[PDB]
């Protein structure tokens, strides 16, 4: 009964571990040992977004690589023009306890969720001229920690009820709910093809789900603490998970195991945000130590530090063309780096 | 600079609006409600009028209080408790009719984000506590309480047990007793909030 099922689960876990070990022929460090390093990547703050008044908890780039939406717990989701530091929109929120935001790839919609257990979709292109809440997606039992736009109609949300859900912004209903995480799912990343995605939970595990069939494909473990940020490799064949154990890790879909760990002894704060570059050569990770460190994603060595924030950096993100890095922080400033 | 002048004008307009909104929001006094399940948070928030976060706001003697009940968040507190780092005080409500709350008070009082914020501790159900003591001795929940079996001393012992969790000299625990049939909760909150405001303003000016 229960004993037999537990024994079967242990046997299956051991088989998975053995199969992952068999696929391990060499590490990423050994293979990328021969290639030349990137040197010192010295990035300088080009712009500073001095609009918000509270902790900035999320910041998502537009698909045009120029517009950016920033969510702070001041009750505002201000849309930014990075080229001129102009405020293009300022959206008041029903609940000031917002801890995620998304920008639609089409540019028409902005999502904003948080402790209210509701993912709110805002229409930027309303004919009346002002921004209005086109939808208020509800149904998560726990706080919504992430939300990403597949298109103008679908959206995937990551919540604190240990479940991720796929929605339809028209019907306002959960098209598909993904279950299997045993802790708060604090992060989410969608694949470039938007047919697969990964979630970073507080059970020190990351799971890859299929949007269409709505089932977990692979479970990735190796972290010693809650994962706070996850991000796909631009090739879509790998992802990086930044946790509170002060280590980022790189996981491969096909190898089904971790390849490199981005850990330094001098660093003890946990990672709040992870993001790759356009080429995937740099892994820019934000830290609770008030600074963002640039990592050589292939040689697992620091390429530079994005120091300049007076508080913990809560969100990082590079543009689609890779021309800039935006790093929001709890000091109520978003800084563009280049 | 053809219509980018007008874009800059719009940006300045909504920056001014953001400044005005932030100034208006700074006037309110943010309070955080915490406690055990059915420990009296609902009772106090309902006796003063007005499953995610349940914000409650009112005005008491020219102060706009904002009570954030977070009892519906049945998740890991460590992932969202940092959102309330700027609250004026943490209102803690304890039901004396029922150790389950002592650990939570210790966790929330030694939290790295709550080392400066004063905690207001409410010990509700005083009359129910007296009835329970009459029914059965109070040593059941506190076996180490080798003392008299009287409500007057039991309340003081429980208050001391709860307050012993304070370790930071910069934060003060205001403990109050309530019988769930009194209108004095608002006045106690107001007194503690005025004291906390004075202390925080003095500390910010460096004089404290």
């Amino acid at each position, epitope marked *: 009964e229960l004993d037999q099922l537990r024994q079967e689960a242990e046997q299956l876990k051991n088989q998975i571990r053995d199969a992952r070990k068999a696929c391990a022929d060499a590490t990423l460090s050994q293979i990328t040992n021969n290639i030349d390093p990137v040197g010192r990547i010295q990035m300088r703050t080009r712009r500073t977004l001095r609009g918000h008044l509270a902790k900035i908890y999320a910041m998502h780039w537009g698909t045009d690589s120029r517009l950016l939406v920033s969510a702070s717990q001041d009750g505002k989701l201000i849309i930014w*023009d990075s080229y001129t530091t102009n405020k293009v929109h300022a959206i008041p929120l029903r609940s000031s306890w917002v801890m995620t935001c998304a920008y639609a790839p089409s540019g028409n919609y902005v999502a904003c969720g948080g402790l209210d257990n509701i993912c709110s979709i805002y229409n930027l292109k309303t004919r009346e001229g002002n921004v209005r809440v086109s939808r208020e997606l509800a149904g998560h039992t726990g706080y919504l920690s992430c939300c990403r736009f597949l298109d103008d109609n679908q959206i995937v949300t990551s919540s604190g009820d240990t479940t991720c859900a796929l929605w339809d912004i028209e019907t306002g209903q959960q098209t598909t709910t993904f279950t299997g995480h045993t802790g708060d799912v604090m992060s989410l990343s969608l694949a470039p093809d938007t047919r697969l995605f990964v979630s970073g939970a507080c059970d020190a595990s990351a799971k890859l789900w299929d949007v269409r069939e709505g089932m977990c494909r692979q479970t990735f473990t190796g972290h010693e603490s809650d994962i706070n940020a996850i991000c796909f490799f631009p090739n879509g064949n790998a992802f990086a998970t930044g946790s509170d154990d002060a280590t980022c890790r790189l996981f491969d879909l096909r190898a089904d195991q971790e390849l490199m760990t981005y850990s330094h002894d001098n660093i003890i704060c946990g990672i709040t945000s992870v993001s790759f570059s356009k080429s995937g050569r740099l892994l820019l990770a934000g830290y609770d130590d008030f600074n963002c460190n640039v990592w050589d994603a292939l040689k697992a060595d620091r390429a530079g530090v994005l120091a300049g924030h007076d508080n913990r950096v809560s969100c990082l993100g590079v543009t689609d063309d890779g021309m800039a890095v935006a790093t929001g922080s709890w000091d109520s400033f978003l800084k563009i780096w280049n | 600079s053809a219509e980018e002048r*007008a874009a800059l004008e*719009r940006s300045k307009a909504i920056e001014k609006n953001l400044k005005e909104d932030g100034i208006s929001a700074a006037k309110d006094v943010k309070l955080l409600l915490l406690g055990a399940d059915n420990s009296g948070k609902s009772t106090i928030v309902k006796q003063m009028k007005i499953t995610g976060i349940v914000e409650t706001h009112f005005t008491f003697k020219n102060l706009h209080f904002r009570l954030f009940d977070v009892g519906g968040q049945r998740s890991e507190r460590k992932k969202w408790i940092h959102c309330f780092e700027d609250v004026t005080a943490i209102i803690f409500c304890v039901d004396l009719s029922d150790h389950e709350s002592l650990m939570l008070f210790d966790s929330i009082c030694n939290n790295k984000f709550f080392i400066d914020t004063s905690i207001i501790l409410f010990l509700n159900k005083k009359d129910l506590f007296g009835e329970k003591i009459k029914k059965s001795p109070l040593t059941i929940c506190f076996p180490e309480y080798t003392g008299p079996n009287t409500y007057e001393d039991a309340a003081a012992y429980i208050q001391a047990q709860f307050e012993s969790k304070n370790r930071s000299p910069n934060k003060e625990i205001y403990c109050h007793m309530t019988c769930a049939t009194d209108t004095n909760n608002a006045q106690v909150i107001f007194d503690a909030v005025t004291d906390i405001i004075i202390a925080n303003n003095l500390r910010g000016c460096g004089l404290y």
Partner: single-chain antibody, 230 residues
Framework: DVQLVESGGGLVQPGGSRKLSCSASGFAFSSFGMHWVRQAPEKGLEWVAYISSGSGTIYYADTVKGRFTISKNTLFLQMTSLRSEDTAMYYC??????????????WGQGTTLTVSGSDIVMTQATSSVPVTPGESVSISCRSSKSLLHSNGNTYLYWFLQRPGQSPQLLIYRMSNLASGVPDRFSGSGSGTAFTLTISRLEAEDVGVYYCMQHLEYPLTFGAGTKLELK
């Protein structure tokens, strides 16, 4: 939904005054910069006045400056010292300017008032064009200055005025299509040569097409191309 109904038209003796009122509804009028555009009974559109959001900046035309003043959800054009050249059908135009916005998108129905140098002049060589449905037509517009700003935006706006109807924005910034305008419309150009291309012409598309610049005030209009049906 969105509507700009405006009144204050009629016969005025020369030298008189009249305050035209534009009533706006169905949209956040407080956050829209309001324009005023007039058509003489036989001539084409002419820019009259512009008032920004929050009344911060107001611009006037060369023939309008001093005489007219532009000032809930109501737009006023205080118009004084009326001359015989002021007679026209004044339109109410809404336009909000942010990154990627669509200025001049909505036009009021317009009210008729009868009175008994450095500008970027836009010239449309073809005053009229005979055309049959189902083919591809083209309308051209020129300019005195290059409209391509250093930030990469050209500021040519294409407007379609159906006979007996208010102008409708078709193409803003010389490349972008307005919402609701069918994909059969396309616009292209560079600096000085601008060409509006219409594919699979329809019966409703017949009208007069107006070319406007937005690089600098005053907002000079084109002479208009009457794409008359043949």
């Amino acid at each position: 939904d969105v509507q700009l109904v405006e009144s204050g038209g009629g016969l005025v003796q020369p030298g008189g005054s009249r305050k035209l009122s534009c009533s706006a509804s169905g949209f956040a009028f407080s956050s829209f910069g309001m324009h005023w555009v007039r058509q003489a009974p036989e001539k084409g559109l002419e820019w009259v006045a512009y008032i920004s959001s929050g009344s911060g900046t107001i611009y006037y035309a060369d023939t309008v400056k001093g005489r007219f003043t532009i000032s809930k959800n109501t737009l006023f054009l205080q118009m004084t010292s009326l001359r015989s050249e002021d007679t026209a059908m004044y339109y109410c135009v809404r336009s909000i300017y942010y990154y990627g916005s669509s200025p001049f998108d909505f036009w009021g129905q317009g009210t008729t008032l009868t009175v008994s140098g450095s500008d970027i002049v836009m010239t449309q060589a073809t005053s009229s064009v005979p055309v049959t449905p189902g083919e591809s037509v083209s309308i051209s517009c020129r300019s005195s200055k290059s409209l391509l700003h250093s930030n990469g935006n050209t500021y040519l706006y294409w407007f379609l005025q159906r006979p007996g109807q208010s102008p409708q924005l078709l193409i803003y910034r010389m490349s972008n299509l307005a919402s609701g305008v069918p994909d059969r419309f396309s616009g292209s150009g560079s600096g000085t040569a601008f060409t509006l291309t219409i594919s699979r012409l329809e019966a409703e598309d017949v009208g007069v097409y107006y070319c406007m610049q937005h690089l600098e005030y005053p907002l000079t209009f084109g002479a208009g191309t009457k794409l008359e049906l043949k």
